[PDB]
Design a protein around this ligand. Sequence first.
Ligand SMILES: O=C1CC[C@H](N2C(=O)c3ccccc3C2=O)C(=O)N1
Ligand SMILES: [Zn+2]
Lengths: 1091, 370
Amino acid sequence: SYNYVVTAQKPTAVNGCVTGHFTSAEDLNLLIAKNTRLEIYVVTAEGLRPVKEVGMYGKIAVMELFRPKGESKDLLFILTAKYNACILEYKQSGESIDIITRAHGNVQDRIGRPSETGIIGIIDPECRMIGLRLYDGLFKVIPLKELKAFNIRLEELHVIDVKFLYGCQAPTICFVYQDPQGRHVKTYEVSLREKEFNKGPWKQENVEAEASMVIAVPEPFGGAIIIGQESITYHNGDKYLAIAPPIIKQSTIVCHNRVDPNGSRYLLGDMEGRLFMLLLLRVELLGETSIAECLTYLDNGVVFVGSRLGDSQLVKLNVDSNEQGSYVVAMETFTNLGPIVDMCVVDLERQGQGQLVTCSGAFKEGSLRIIRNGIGIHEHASIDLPGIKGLWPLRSDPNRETDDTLVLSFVGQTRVLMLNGEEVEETELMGFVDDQQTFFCGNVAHQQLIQITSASVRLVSQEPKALVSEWKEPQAKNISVASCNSSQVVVAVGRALYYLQIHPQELRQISHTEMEHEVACLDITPLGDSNGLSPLCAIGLWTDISARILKLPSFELLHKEMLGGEIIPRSILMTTFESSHYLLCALGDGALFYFGLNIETGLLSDRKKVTLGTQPTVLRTFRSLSTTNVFACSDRPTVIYSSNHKLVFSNVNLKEVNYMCPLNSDGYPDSLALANNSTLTIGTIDEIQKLHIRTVPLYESPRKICYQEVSQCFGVLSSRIEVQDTSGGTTALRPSASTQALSSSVSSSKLFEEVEVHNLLIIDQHTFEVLHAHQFLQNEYALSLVSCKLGKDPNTYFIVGTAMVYPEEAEPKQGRIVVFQYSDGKLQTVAEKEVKGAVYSMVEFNGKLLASINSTVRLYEWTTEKELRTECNHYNNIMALYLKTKGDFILVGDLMRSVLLLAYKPMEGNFEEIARDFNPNWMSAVEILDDDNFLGAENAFNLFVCQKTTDEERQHLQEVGLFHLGEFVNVFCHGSLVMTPTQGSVLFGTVNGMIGLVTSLSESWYNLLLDMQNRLNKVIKSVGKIEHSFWRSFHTERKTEPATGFIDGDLIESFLDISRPKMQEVVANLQKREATADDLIKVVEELTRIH
Amino acid sequence: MINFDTSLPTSHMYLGSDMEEFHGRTLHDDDSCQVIPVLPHVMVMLIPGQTLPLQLFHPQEVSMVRNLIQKDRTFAVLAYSNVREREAHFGTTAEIYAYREEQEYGIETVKVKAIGRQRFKVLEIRTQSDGIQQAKVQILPERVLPSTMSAVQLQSLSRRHIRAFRQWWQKYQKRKFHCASLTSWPPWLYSLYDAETLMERVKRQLHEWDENLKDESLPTNPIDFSYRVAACLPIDDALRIQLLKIGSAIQRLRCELDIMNKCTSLCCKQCQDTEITTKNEIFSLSLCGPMAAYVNPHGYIHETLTVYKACNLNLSGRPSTEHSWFPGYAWTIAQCRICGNHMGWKFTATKKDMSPQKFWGLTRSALLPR
Ligand SMILES: O=C1CC[C@H](N2C(=O)c3ccccc3C2=O)C(=O)N1
Ligand SMILES: [Zn+2]
């Protein structure tokens, strides 16, 4: 087996964030770490300025800015989880932006145990060194080219937190450490010239038993602020100040930030999302935010909340508290899918079009997320007007800046609509003809309007509305094709062309030409710094099938591209994306050609073909969020946009669009008028991006998810934290999904301080409202969930596998398997089967129920009496956490990668152990790929694949795939977000919010792409200069083996992004059979279509 | 309360004092192939860290070890799957730590004390003309895994370090495995795989056996701890090999807890249904556990389990102190009442002030936890 792995969605969760002057010493920067990604920003004061986003071949562990002596801006230090260290400098020259490595090296030690309190990366205030705490009992020092490093024998093994002390003659580190006596704060002086440690400036002062963080405070203060559970203490030798505020008792302070550069104010954040102000000691609660992983103070009043459990934030710290008493007000919310703890692919809306519903976030940040491929439209008006052949917006009042008129074209007719606010009404524009089909009309030069019909070119004045000029072909012939801007008109009469200019009360005929063939399409869009006057005319011709760039007024041929074929070009358009000029040409077969256009020469370069639909595509330019885009009207409506100076094509979630135009009216602002076969719809466009994310906040933890088609709803396992009240039970912390249910229910017992309450939620597949919530038993922990049909019974049941959890018990002694039926908007309990253990997993096994009870694997038969009956058992000696199936072949999984394959013998009515493998490593997820293969997630963010004459050979599974993903997969799911080269499709959801896709490849296709990877890695410049092979190497604390049987799709996809001469280099002598660059463009393009 | 010195059995005083001690340690690289000699009259399974006492008198064995001292000092102890057809796929290396040569009765004799070191995979068993077999073996590495949460937590929560102890352990579970909320499994599940947790669960049973146990005597490392405990569980040969195959200390502790919990009664292997003793009667009279390996005067190794009360036993003959493995106690032969199977011995104090005044030394080959 040979597999292919690609990123469907980048990691969303925030790992860290910093402030400084990285770009220029003038611009205040905000650097956000999204694991393998680095987002760089400028504090706009009126928002957030996105400058650059760079990917990296490592997981970011440390990220801190620094300015050593004389520097034009800031230097950035990054350390990966694989111990890749680097110093990065920013470099900008016009529209070209590049991150530059200054120094790089791998700091990993040959021996040593990685510390329990993680990797600690501190820097001296004078920029003299880099302090690293990677291993217990050692302190690595990097004096800030090849990042030279050395160790110092640190006597105190268990270090909690450490920081470099400010204002010291000899560099000093202050650390909280624990020993059998207690937890104490200590100081040590680090010598570079002696390469050793010497006694610190002050004595080992005893701190709180739960002292967690050291906050190095700058001059004139100096010393450190130690933070604990109940207390905040300050140490500076003979100087001491101990405070114990009750307001910080509920939750532990997990993160901080410096507000005043001198060190008078500090932001504090707990695990419950409370924000505090440490004033210089006094603490004041500011308000509530998302559960902050990291905090950053930027500019005046604005704060960045970097959340890993929920959506990240921008919040304002007001001087005056509101009515509720909160000094915190939410400005902007940033979508975070992480952690994805479970998910499923459901054909919501349209069949074939897959959607991904996830169990995202935790605690108060708990949510459902619906991820759908394509941009959406928000309908505000819908009118019955069938057979629209054209749409044009107008401003009937020259004094107004907004569109108040919409002009429609029909077969041989023209209708005019007026927009009186939100009211659309049928009207007649004076000067315009209604008995002729319109090809164009709009606001033109000298406060005038134009209307190009099949018969003439009509010029109408705005004060009053009357015909001022009219143009016709000399032999009274019909206009075939027409193009018009604000000053110019170019019309075709078969083979003939006519160039007109729009003057006051005059349509002046400048020039005319005869073309080699019949005219098919025209465009005279003015590009560049051209004040509504285009010196170019784009034209598509019949028979020869050519896209031609003509000069105005001469009509001289500048360029002629031979499109090829029997299919005539239907639409032609000149456009500008990210200051780069392009020519788009659509054929009658739905094919789209796109070249780069030189405004001066007329040359069309970098020919690219893309298949949009089956019907001829119509191209219309529209504005969205102060950015020019192109709407491609066909049976597959598409938005054509620019991302990193490359054209992107995202689909629109509409059955078909024939014609469209942008409408900006007083009633419908910054809108889009769309027309199909039957109706005209006015609406607003969503975010112009590949995927769309709908958020359904639950305000509690979503754990599991499945879908019931027959009920048109989802089954969701969820848990809420409740506190022990001064009564015989518990009370909630806030209203949540399970509390605010439409109809509620509780389990009736039949079996013999913060509490976790478990529930089975019922959510509608359209509205996403809690129709029903079934609360489980006290101390009952819901584990597994499946929506299926069992036995001869034709009703679909929502089945839940539970465990009775008690503090004294280590391994659950009790558990239930509960069969529910969802009818009349309420869950009805059908069967309650008590088992002697935890029901970790359940799967529908060919009309039977296969469920795990601790170590045992049970098969249940669903009788006519509607109750599960024990058939056969398999006692495994390994915990049955994972239970996956395909036909009569069963996979049994342990958290320690102990996999064993079972087979149910139908005639025998017993289980047979096919094969087994026992190689200890932490396993987070597993899925069956095919009949002989299975995919899984292994310790240290890795992926693996296992395959299947002699018995001692057949009874053993072989590890065929090994790959370092850089992500922690919690769920694998068969499905696709897309409407053959590869076999199968498995999606995966991670802790960081990253979504990925795994597909199979052929033996030779794998070798072709692997060869290509080795060649791409010689061309592509790596951020921080990390070798791709090293990054992808299957890594554990023990072994680091190169990746096997896996292709990095993300790397393969960047071939379509590299320069054309660089593509030539990669393909040169690549291959035995020879390989063209054109062949490899098609192959790589085909692979981008899977996601 | 017991006043017997628990350290006394572990020193094998019956083997005699004044033995040449060796300090130097030999360790083979992981997955590396080695050719190690095998002692022909050893039929016991050795667990790493376990003390193996020997009394060798067969000329070929005496010469083998005598030469072994002059070099490596390590020999191979095979875990037989079928002791009759001498079939073994696994084993453990034994390094000599105490050695003594004697000459008496016209023969050259040698007494050794070795310790289990490294588990291995048998690749081929070649035989020499003198009777001593050589074994082409592959060293099996000890697999150490990090915290279950180590990977998932690369965040701020990292700096949260690990009657009435009950609440500490709950605070420990809630704290250490808080990041389980990011995963698809509960904190109570991650505990079932935590080395510290699994060890404290075993330490609970160890204290029920040794009422005068001090935690300082127990190994801190789960690798050394899982192995110490493995060697004192009175289980059948088939289950012992399964335990020796285990590469992880976690998988081993989880396994040992299953054995410890499922265990109830210990019967006579021969008649199968005759109950001899129960889990509640097991106690640690030695620091290396309730069960340990000892040699009789003829080099036959008996892995004996110390219990206070035994049931269907018949004694024959009068007590003897000759070659006693528990100094201060006299042994008297014990057999199953039903079949007559040699079950071990009854140990009785030679002084009135000794505690326990009596106990039973049962050989594991005679027992069946059925
Ligand atoms: O503590 C003990 C129990 C008895 C044991 N023992 C035996 O197993 C044996 C077998 C044959 C002849 C002599 C003896 C003997 O003293 C022994 O050597 N020490
Ligand atoms: Zn018997």
